[PDB]
Motif scaffolding. Structure first.
Motif, PDB file in Angstrom:
ATOM      1  N   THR A 138       8.928  -1.269  -5.506  1.00 22.00           N
ATOM      2  CA  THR A 138       7.927  -2.220  -5.014  1.00 22.00           C
ATOM      3  C   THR A 138       7.144  -1.523  -3.896  1.00 22.00           C
ATOM      4  OG1 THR A 138       8.954  -4.313  -5.724  1.00 22.00           O
ATOM      5  CG2 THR A 138       7.648  -4.425  -3.748  1.00 22.00           C
ATOM      6  N   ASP A 139       5.912  -1.974  -3.713  1.00 18.18           N
ATOM      7  CA  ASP A 139       4.937  -1.252  -2.944  1.00 18.18           C
ATOM      8  C   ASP A 139       3.862  -2.180  -2.355  1.00 18.18           C
ATOM      9  OD1 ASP A 139       2.842   1.046  -2.636  1.00 18.18           O
ATOM     10  OD2 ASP A 139       4.832   1.898  -3.158  1.00 18.18           O
ATOM     11  N   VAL A 140       3.923  -2.438  -1.045  1.00 22.83           N
ATOM     12  CA  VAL A 140       3.005  -3.414  -0.460  1.00 22.83           C
ATOM     13  C   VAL A 140       1.889  -2.628   0.172  1.00 22.83           C
ATOM     14  CG1 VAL A 140       2.777  -5.397   1.116  1.00 22.83           C
ATOM     15  CG2 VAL A 140       4.856  -5.078  -0.211  1.00 22.83           C
ATOM     16  N   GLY A 141       0.786  -2.470  -0.563  1.00 20.60           N
ATOM     17  CA  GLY A 141      -0.235  -1.453  -0.249  1.00 20.60           C
ATOM     18  C   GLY A 141      -1.665  -1.904  -0.001  1.00 20.60           C
ATOM     19  N   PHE A 142      -2.456  -1.021   0.615  1.00 21.60           N
ATOM     20  CA  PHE A 142      -3.864  -1.300   0.963  1.00 21.60           C
ATOM     21  C   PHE A 142      -4.693  -0.018   0.962  1.00 21.60           C
ATOM     22  CE2 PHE A 142      -3.885   0.244   5.346  1.00 21.60           C
ATOM     23  CZ  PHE A 142      -2.529   0.292   5.624  1.00 21.60           C
ATOM     24  N   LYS A 143      -6.019  -0.168   0.807  1.00 16.17           N
ATOM     25  CA  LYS A 143      -7.033   0.913   0.860  1.00 16.17           C
ATOM     26  C   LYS A 143      -8.200   0.403   1.660  1.00 16.17           C
ATOM     27  CE  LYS A 143      -6.611   4.066  -3.100  1.00 16.17           C
ATOM     28  NZ  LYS A 143      -6.942   4.372  -4.529  1.00 16.17           N
ATOM     29  N   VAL A 195       4.181  -0.237   9.110  1.00 16.67           N
ATOM     30  CA  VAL A 195       2.997   0.390   8.518  1.00 16.67           C
ATOM     31  C   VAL A 195       3.142   1.913   8.342  1.00 16.67           C
ATOM     32  CG1 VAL A 195       1.678   0.634  10.679  1.00 16.67           C
ATOM     33  CG2 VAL A 195       0.445   0.301   8.519  1.00 16.67           C
ATOM     34  N   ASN A 196       2.566   2.447   7.279  1.00 19.57           N
ATOM     35  CA  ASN A 196       2.635   3.874   7.033  1.00 19.57           C
ATOM     36  C   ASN A 196       1.385   4.332   6.290  1.00 19.57           C
ATOM     37  OD1 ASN A 196       3.286   6.564   6.343  1.00 19.57           O
ATOM     38  ND2 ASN A 196       4.742   5.912   4.756  1.00 19.57           N
ATOM     39  N   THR A 197       0.582   5.124   6.978  1.00 20.25           N
ATOM     40  CA  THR A 197      -0.589   5.722   6.367  1.00 20.25           C
ATOM     41  C   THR A 197      -0.492   7.247   6.456  1.00 20.25           C
ATOM     42  OG1 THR A 197      -1.882   5.440   8.398  1.00 20.25           O
ATOM     43  CG2 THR A 197      -2.030   3.711   6.792  1.00 20.25           C
ATOM     44  N   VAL A 215      -8.683   5.330   3.558  1.00 20.93           N
ATOM     45  CA  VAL A 215      -7.319   5.275   4.107  1.00 20.93           C
ATOM     46  C   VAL A 215      -6.442   4.440   3.165  1.00 20.93           C
ATOM     47  CG1 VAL A 215      -5.857   5.042   6.128  1.00 20.93           C
ATOM     48  CG2 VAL A 215      -8.287   5.335   6.421  1.00 20.93           C
ATOM     49  N   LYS A 216      -5.399   5.088   2.644  1.00 25.76           N
ATOM     50  CA  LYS A 216      -4.396   4.443   1.802  1.00 25.76           C
ATOM     51  C   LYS A 216      -3.124   4.280   2.644  1.00 25.76           C
ATOM     52  N   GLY A 217      -2.372   3.205   2.414  1.00 30.33           N
ATOM     53  CA  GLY A 217      -1.166   2.919   3.186  1.00 30.33           C
ATOM     54  C   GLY A 217      -0.397   1.734   2.657  1.00 30.33           C
ATOM     55  N   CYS A 218       0.898   1.696   2.982  1.00 30.15           N
ATOM     56  CA  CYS A 218       1.782   0.558   2.661  1.00 30.15           C
ATOM     57  C   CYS A 218       2.487   0.022   3.879  1.00 30.15           C
ATOM     58  CB  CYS A 218       2.851   0.933   1.637  1.00 30.15           C
ATOM     59  SG  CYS A 218       3.721   2.460   2.002  1.00 30.15           S
ATOM     60  N   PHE A 219       3.354  -0.950   3.645  1.00 29.44           N
ATOM     61  CA  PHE A 219       4.305  -1.355   4.653  1.00 29.44           C
ATOM     62  C   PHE A 219       5.684  -1.096   4.093  1.00 29.44           C
ATOM     63  CE2 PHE A 219       1.422  -3.329   7.668  1.00 29.44           C
ATOM     64  CZ  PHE A 219       0.308  -3.636   6.891  1.00 29.44           C
TER      65      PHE A 219
HETATM   66  C1  9UM Z   1       3.809   2.886   0.513  1.00 29.60           C
HETATM   67  C2  9UM Z   1       2.925   4.082   0.451  1.00 29.60           C
HETATM   68  C3  9UM Z   1       3.244   5.406   0.862  1.00 29.60           C
HETATM   69  C4  9UM Z   1       4.550   5.881   1.435  1.00 29.60           C
HETATM   70  C5  9UM Z   1       2.082   6.200   0.628  1.00 29.60           C
HETATM   71  O1  9UM Z   1       1.915   7.400   0.826  1.00 29.60           O
HETATM   72  N1  9UM Z   1       1.099   5.373   0.073  1.00 29.60           N
HETATM   73  C6  9UM Z   1      -0.216   5.404  -0.410  1.00 29.60           C
HETATM   74  O2  9UM Z   1      -0.902   6.417  -0.430  1.00 29.60           O
HETATM   75  C7  9UM Z   1      -0.548   4.090  -0.853  1.00 29.60           C
HETATM   76  C8  9UM Z   1      -1.842   3.624  -1.458  1.00 29.60           C
HETATM   77  C9  9UM Z   1       0.580   3.278  -0.607  1.00 29.60           C
HETATM   78  C10 9UM Z   1       0.691   1.825  -0.920  1.00 29.60           C
HETATM   79  N2  9UM Z   1       1.602   4.073  -0.043  1.00 29.60           N
END
Ligand code: 9UM
Ligand code: 9UM
Ligand code: 9UM
Ligand code: 9UM
Lengths: 171, 171, 171, 171
Positions: C11-16, D57-59, D25-29
């Protein structure tokens, strides 16, 4: 099922798209004082010292002028004025020279170079002196840690100084 | 050496600084045709086909409208019209549904989703039908290789479609 | 109805989110010729003429360098070289002076000012002369109708010239 | 006067120019909890409630992640978590549906629509259930008065949510 015909008068085939536009903010200060020492025999500045009341800023717009006084800009409550102090005038010829001085904006000081161009040295209507000259140069917001919150993308790092002066002899 | 006093009336302590501003371009097309098949018993679209004359664009500005027709945009000489063709209407309830169709801009075709919102299904003044509805959705310039020369910085990749329709029954 | 528990490992709670970043492109030209006439008795340049092969550009990147040669930039097929011609050296002191000359980029010519700073005038290992000096100044893309297709938003209107020279006596 | 020849090995014909670049910017929690109620007989969500620890948070970057917690962003000291609460699931077919719910970011709440796409409903290795599904939608920083200090130029107003879920049955 049934068939319809648009009423074009109350129909609307529409779109919205976001774009950027670059523009110059131009502005002066309505209130400042200066001390000007100049030798027409040699066309050299001897002393030039300016104080500008940050409060008197004018960029043809009410709400931006107010905004300039706040923490993200001038902090005019704490630092009411910006100052310029000439340290050196290096002559090029009679029309041109390189001015070095200390600029202070919100208590941070840096030495800058302005380009002096003499617009014309005369004796006035009454036989007392006049001079007309300009000072031009670029300074960097970053050198004065000015508006540090605002990105160098939104608002440019470079500020262009245009000081245009007419001036008469004393006493 | 000699001493001078600024004549403040012909003196000017000035600056110029460059900033960016973001703004929405809003616009419609003045000339288009459509075919509309709709069943008020079930609130389902059956056929929706639109053709828009690129030439009839209007963004409240003469020189930009012209510019839209050139190679860096619409290429209206070669591709005079853009077209929409419904392929599927998926009902949500009587007020709402998801429309899928084929959009063609300068000969490049992609399938898009529009959000159908029914503004109101009535029988008119004369006892013949009317409907009012809207179609909304975002499309990407990049998906249609549209205006490829213009950066996604200057002009946004996203175009927002707002189609507002009033419409009367046929024959 | 039924109840579930996320498997957090798949599972992956993600954003851009899209942002802008400003950066300096730094670069030189690997191939150029010059003619240098300089009088160490008076620290004055007499003649300075430079030719630069547009083809020899290097900004530490293969595909951008190629791209620089195309129509939207240098047009290196039609205009293989850019040239600088000194017209005037105005001395400030022995370390500093103001150079005026003609720059030509893709056949468009404008007069520019460079800031000459003498890094040091010596007699070498063998008793034959050397000099080290720098030329610095800002030119505007717009003054040379350069890269007119690219907005002044994406790529800055200002180009900063840093010419750093070491050089030995002749024959 | 005297004549010189560049030593090309210690000479450098150079330039600097500022440009913009757009990037995602891509990232999850890394840390969140959820409650998931789903009926495989009808492929309808019944309850979906998520809590996300802003702190997690992790970007892919240490100093930006820290920065996200400060006043100009999340204010994680005062508002440690963001929450999602489903209010309505409107079915499209067995693979697709429109989810409406309440998102809360730093104590400001707005109702959003996510696009539910069912990736596959199975009975696992052991004969106990699994599901895989995704939630996608765009929210506006401005709707949540989020990062109000940062311009919509530097950082985009639109945030794209991609929630990818695998999940197993309970007790
Ligand atoms: C959750 C996660 C990690 C660890 C990561 O590197 N990235 C991304 O690049 C995206 C889009 C997401 C969600 N995550
Ligand atoms: C069709 C049309 C006209 C004439 C106009 O001014 N505008 C807008 O501002 C929008 C958004 C649309 C559509 N139109
Ligand atoms: C001083 C002043 C006023 C009143 C004005 O409108 N402008 C400008 O546009 C500039 C550049 C300056 C200086 N001023
Ligand atoms: C000439 C040259 C090379 C090879 C290089 O990497 N760089 C820079 O980064 C600058 C500023 C210059 C000049 N050069």
């Amino acid at each position: 099922m049934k068939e319809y015909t648009l009423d074009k008068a109350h129909t609307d085939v529409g779109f919205k798209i976001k774009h950027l536009q670059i523009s110059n903010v131009k502005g002066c200060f309505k209130d400042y004082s200066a001390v000007i020492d100049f030798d027409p025999a040699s066309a050299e500045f001897k002393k030039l010292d300016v104080t500008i009341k940050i409060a008197s800023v004018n960029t043809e717009n009410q709400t931006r002028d107010n905004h300039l006084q706040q923490d993200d800009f001038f902090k005019a409550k704490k630092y009411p004025d910006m100052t310029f102090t000439m340290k050196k005038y290096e002559k090029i010829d009679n029309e041109k020279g390189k001015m070095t001085g200390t600029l202070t904006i919100a208590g941070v000081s840096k030495d800058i170079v302005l380009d002096a161009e003499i617009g014309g040295v005369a004796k006035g209507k009454d036989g007392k002196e006049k001079i007309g000259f300009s000072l031009n140069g670029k300074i960097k917001r970053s050198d004065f840690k000015f508006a540090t919150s605002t990105s160098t993308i939104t608002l440019s790092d470079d500020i262009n100084l245009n000081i245009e002066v007419e001036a008469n002899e004393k006493e």
